[PDB]
Point group: D2
Chain length 458, copies 4
């Protein structure tokens, strides 16, 4: 494995502590064996998400301090509008309080727009892979969320350059099956979070957009990790090995009509989101009319002015190639420590997380005994590291658990490679009691979203 040095130095620290196993195990009892219900006081290193836990720069805090809190016409709204025009070449912006706020703004509008003239009677969204909140909004609006990720993503340990690509064959089949008139939009998720943070190639984005444009289908770029996608295109696509990251981004967004962004990811923020529309004024007007009751007035969108100011700065810092190389290299370093030790991962590692594959380390625990969770709980009891499950405890009602992933999600510019080593050694050291591991059962199961609030028991 290769350690890559920080292209920065530390200016402010935040204390963290590992609770004693007596404290650590008592906290898991009261938590009901669900890490989502643990308080942060009980977590050493927190790998639950890369969302909103990033470390900002001094320039970002300086922007927050001079942020314009005006209810209408904030200086930072116009800055954010100019920045989206610079990065994506899109003429219209609506800030949102975070990613799913942006989805709430835009997806109901696209459905209403598609259902003009009385079409879209069987409305669907098609994505390489809809993220959970994205799919939830698709379905809350009475549509179907169709995921057509490339089959390469399903062969975890076999390298491929672009495991986030659309299955182009399935895109055409679905357009034929449902009809272009029922397809509300195509959602291109970059990077493809649910496939393991795996990149979508520039030629896949291009071909998907050209196919959709030919059928008059609107394309939204789910852009939470668009900079981590742009880096992979520069690193794996020869046509772009000599291009700046901003050049890769500018081309990427020729292949979408709008974007929804969680700025809690690649823009390096702790809160914030964005809608941006290339040139459809009518959809922009309609989305603004939804923004007002759901989020806020159209020039802050549920954000403080200081957070729009931090977004303007964080959008620039997140395109910097030397940071991205360090960021994605640190993720790759953790993955290499793991697979050099014989732990299966989605290879290659994505931009933001290491995905530990199905539990070939706990064979005695089946699907509905939650094998990834028992790993996570022993991993938590042995080290204090909170990870998130992507398996039979997330999927729910039992829909076939094709993968028993464990996601080690890494916040940006927060943890060092020595933190990565601690993570790796903890998980490797679980090859002592991996076999002698008890399964878990529902002591309290909620009707929906159980992985958030279900109380389990060994």
């Amino acid at each position: 494995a290769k350690r890559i040095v920080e292209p920065f130095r530390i200016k402010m620290v935040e204390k963290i502590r590992v609770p004693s196993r007596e404290e650590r195990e008592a906290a898991l009892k009261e938590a009901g064996y669900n890490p989502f219900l643990l308080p942060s006081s009980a977590v050493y290193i927190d790998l639950l998400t890369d969302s909103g836990t990033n470390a900002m720069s001094d320039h970002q805090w300086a922007a927050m301090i001079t942020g314009d809190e005006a209810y209408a016409g904030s200086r930072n709204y116009y800055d954010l509008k100019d920045k989206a025009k610079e990065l994506f070449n899109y003429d219209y912006i609506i800030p949102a309080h975070q990613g799913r706020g942006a989805e709430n703004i835009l997806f109901p509008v696209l459905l209403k727009y598609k259902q003009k003239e009385g079409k879209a009677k069987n409305p669907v969204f098609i994505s390489n892979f809809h993220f959970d909140t994205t799919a939830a909004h698709v379905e809350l609006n009475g549509c179907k969320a169709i995921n057509i990720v490339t089959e390469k993503a399903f062969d975890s340990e076999t390298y491929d350059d672009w495991k986030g690509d659309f299955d182009i064959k399935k895109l055409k089949e679905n357009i034929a099956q449902h009809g272009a008139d029922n397809i509300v939009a195509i959602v291109s998720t970059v990077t493809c979070n649910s496939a393991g943070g795996q990149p979508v190639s520039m030629s896949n984005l291009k071909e998907v957009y050209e196919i959709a444009k030919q059928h008059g289908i609107f394309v939204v770029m789910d852009s939470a990790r668009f900079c981590e996608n742009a880096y992979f295109i520069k690193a794996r696509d020869p046509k772009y090995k000599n291009a700046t990251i901003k050049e890769v981004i500018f081309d990427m967004y020729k292949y979408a009509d709008a974007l929804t962004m969680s700025a809690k990811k690649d823009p390096l923020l702790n809160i914030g989101g964005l809608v941006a529309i290339r040139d459809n004024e009518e959809i922009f007007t309609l989305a603004r009319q939804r923004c007002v009751p759901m989020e806020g007035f159209v020039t802050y969108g549920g954000l403080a002015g200081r957070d729009m100011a931090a977004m303007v700065q964080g959008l620039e810092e997140g395109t910097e190639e030397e940071y991205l190389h360090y960021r994605i290299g640190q993720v790759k370093y953790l993955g290499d420590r793991l697979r050099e030790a014989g732990i299966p991962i989605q290879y290659p590692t994505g931009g933001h997380a290491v995905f530990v594959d199905c539990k070939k380390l706990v064979p005695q625990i089946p699907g509905d005994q939650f094998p990834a969770q028992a790993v996570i709980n022993a991993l938590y009891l042995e080290s204090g590291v909170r990870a998130v499950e992507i398996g039979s405890f997330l999927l729910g009602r039992q829909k076939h658990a094709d993968m028993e992933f464990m996601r080690l999600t890494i916040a940006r510019r927060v943890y060092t490679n020595d933190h990565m080593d601690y993570i790796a050694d903890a998980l490797i050291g679980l090859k002592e009691k991996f076999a002698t591991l008890k399964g878990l059962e529902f002591e309290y199961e909620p009707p929906v979203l159980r992985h958030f609030t279900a109380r389990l028991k060994p």
Copy 2:
């Protein structure tokens, strides 16, 4: 008019300027004669709103700096849960990114809950007066927003202690006509924003909650300005003459089942909101399930951790009687400066804004040609002060019974010398009020036109 001194001193300043007349003339023309389209660079004193423009304390900023940004289990979530138990005696909280996000969490849930066993077939919400976003969410969910403020609120110059009271006669009348099966919730707005920021008496809240409980009707306390309501209760109710502000609050929330709070008002914040439920754990569970797709995870709700930390501190600071006395007295001071110059206003002044009747200043302008807005634009050209129009321009395509101008005062931002500037600007126009002309449309959108309609003189 009596000045009351700040119970604080200034620790940090934000510099503001008066644009030159040429610049103000040019800016307003660029804005199409609609101050909601003005950038903040075009405004000197901004009285558009009291929402999110408040000045925070050093303790609030310090609380933000140590804020826990954890995705799940943030330490500040538990502090906020405790604070809401302390202030209101409510056992459950769901943070929200701001007030209309709190409404979007709670209100659809209250309807679904009422629809059990085929009730709520013609559902309605009843309020002393529903705010704009409050009624919008009621209407968005297929319900009717019914306002039954006391008739005393319509007699603008006649003093009354409680111009935000429920009309009890209309409350039982509406329960009789619609049936308790159709009343999803009663919403107690404290203070009553649309009545001029006018207080609701403790007895009015008590009788309303008694009537709603005898019919099994859920009661939501819209709590954006609950501290100004608590101050007015202590000032004007002999029963609470020697009670602390927190003791007045604690009694207030014995007369509701839940609250929706915009923390951007009285809790002295730039962003933030809150749902709190007294003891109904089923409604709490259901609201959490709506929180996840719409706002975020249930322990941050679309807020940064630093803002939950700022909210915990602001909730305390907003209850301090000496601050409330100064804040509400500053609003009173501006209102007294205007009355003493013969300007009609809603009397007495409410807790956060002065409301001017423009039908008397510009009688030569009918309501359909926006007399109040023509005063606001003249006020702007002469002063750079930005007000907000409550009248035919806000009402929409509709005969408005009043052409108001709201001078909304942010908390701890402007001095009484700023109040003097505002008063003197409006007064100085006394002889030009009759020589100025109304506005017509250059551009008008279909809904909520007051944000983006471009007007033109005649």
Copy 3:
């Protein structure tokens, strides 16, 4: 009296409170009847000094957050050097932790430079008026500190444009009596703090610099309140009535060879100082050699990088005429309030404080019993406002020409409503002035006794 409105609004507040009369009585006895020994918690409105108590801007705080803390070559050192070149046309800077650090850097250097050829055996410094730390460093280096302010400064109620001027005839008399070879330097203090913050005219500074040059005498501009002095030159000198503040400043510094500056005054800071030298590289090198053991390395001088960063921004904001108009106008407003009620003050009021002439307020108490200090302690017990003595106590018994109580006004901290509290407090003691007693030492330090001396009433 004319209230002038803030050219800014409040962005952050700080709690202050009024201690009870019991608290005040115990605190003053505990402090040895010396308000300098009072804790800040025992003070309501603190008028002890205008030094380091100023409210910074959000831009100043933003500068601190990106401040460069490097030990050598901080980015903000070079920014400060450029700013000094811009404002004063001076080519050399040495930062200092505050004003008396700057004096400790430069004065001993000037003493040894002057006597490098076996002359200056009876070394003296000449000033319109050395402030106390200035005179202390003069005497601490074995020199005499001569003060020759205009006789106009001693006639309190009689207006004059330039009550800080040098007495040019005394300057000539002192040069002849002591000889140019014994005059280490002329210090031009602007504004003249000890005369009441009273301005020096451009033609006075010019005539002093020309007299010094023909005799070969080095001139140091004590620059703590140089921007206030510039404002008065533009206010009262028809030659400069239509110049900018920065043009006035530029012309001022053609009439010195170097400056010492407490940046805790006009540059709007809480800490910081500065030495700047026009073009004498030898004295610059000698001053740097002393800076290293006394203050720090020459590119930070005992300041954090963030404080140099704040100083670059504050040097700009401190020159803004709209700011200076408000600041000096607030001082004038408190003075006019007291003058209208018959309280004798130094008229016209200076830039930073109102100086109450206690020689007339309490004529029964002779100067050796500190009449102004008896009024100050009475003002504190009566109201919790803490002021400072600029008379016999501070002079270190040396005969005093002025017995002042100084109401010193911090920049951008208190409102005119705080000023009304101060004025009404002092006005309300009009009948108790005669019934006041002198004070007597119980512990007297040898150097600058007034800071730590313990006193007892008579």
Copy 4:
């Protein structure tokens, strides 16, 4: 070499950049081959000092935001006074703007105090090793700065537990040859910076104080790195194996009557200093009277209230053993990476810096041609790392001959700021110096282009021969 994980995570970052090889070649020439004259923009990793460059915590910044800026009686002065009582059991405090301001407050007062009754006719100060600013203030007040560090410190490759100890034999001899009337004070420097950030044992501190106490000699603990000293005492003195760091500190200061502190070191600050005095109220009153002209009023002492607020919190954080273990272990890691590559260093590594013995690195460069500076300049040109010399360039010219003052060592100091750099930054530093091993032989000495008379190392210009 063992890497040790941070007992914290990162909350705020500051960008850094590697100037291109040519940028470093131009900048070092503009700086006259003296890195002290390079701007911070010319530097990648800055190892010039560990003073004032530390990374603060969120609690520290929060404390600054609520800091009381009052001129007299700031709430944070009383907090700082209580913290010094809790930590050291000392009853009196005087803030200073930083450590050499604390020295300027107290050392002239100490000489004046001893001078009563005609004593101190030929005054001296005795220390294990006076630091540069400390000796300058001693000498500025007309005293001689005597340094009696244990001879073990000169044997850089030979390990010892307490290379910062006083030499007790030389201490008694110096009390004999000068007389207790001429010893203004003994200055215990913890850790001993000049000796390599090397700890002083508790029994060495105790014996020195007992010797001085029976002879009427005031003892000042130079306390810039007292927490790092305390960690080493717990780490190497079996007596305190079971003690907390605060208990070790509390014992250390039974063996002094006052302290002077640069809070820009172990209290994790960017600015700040402190005089604290155990019980001598007369010394405290005199030091207060000097504080007023030189630093400021006695309740802020030349510090903004926010910095006193940050000091109270940083004083606490700097005592936390889990932080000290990581901090000192990071320094040890850099040293071990260098030792494993055959690079000679002061062994064991001290608390705050790795000291590289440059006499053995560049034999072809004599002491007058600045061997340590030549290594430092090559290290900068090769990697953009800025280090500092503790050798013949800092020493200067002998006042009695006008030629090079012969140095008994020739260190390059890799000074590590607290909580700023990661162990991957340490690898960059080590690899940079290792990668010059074959190039050391072809390194050339340095020659003056501009030389000032005093303190030439801060501002002199040089050129290669």
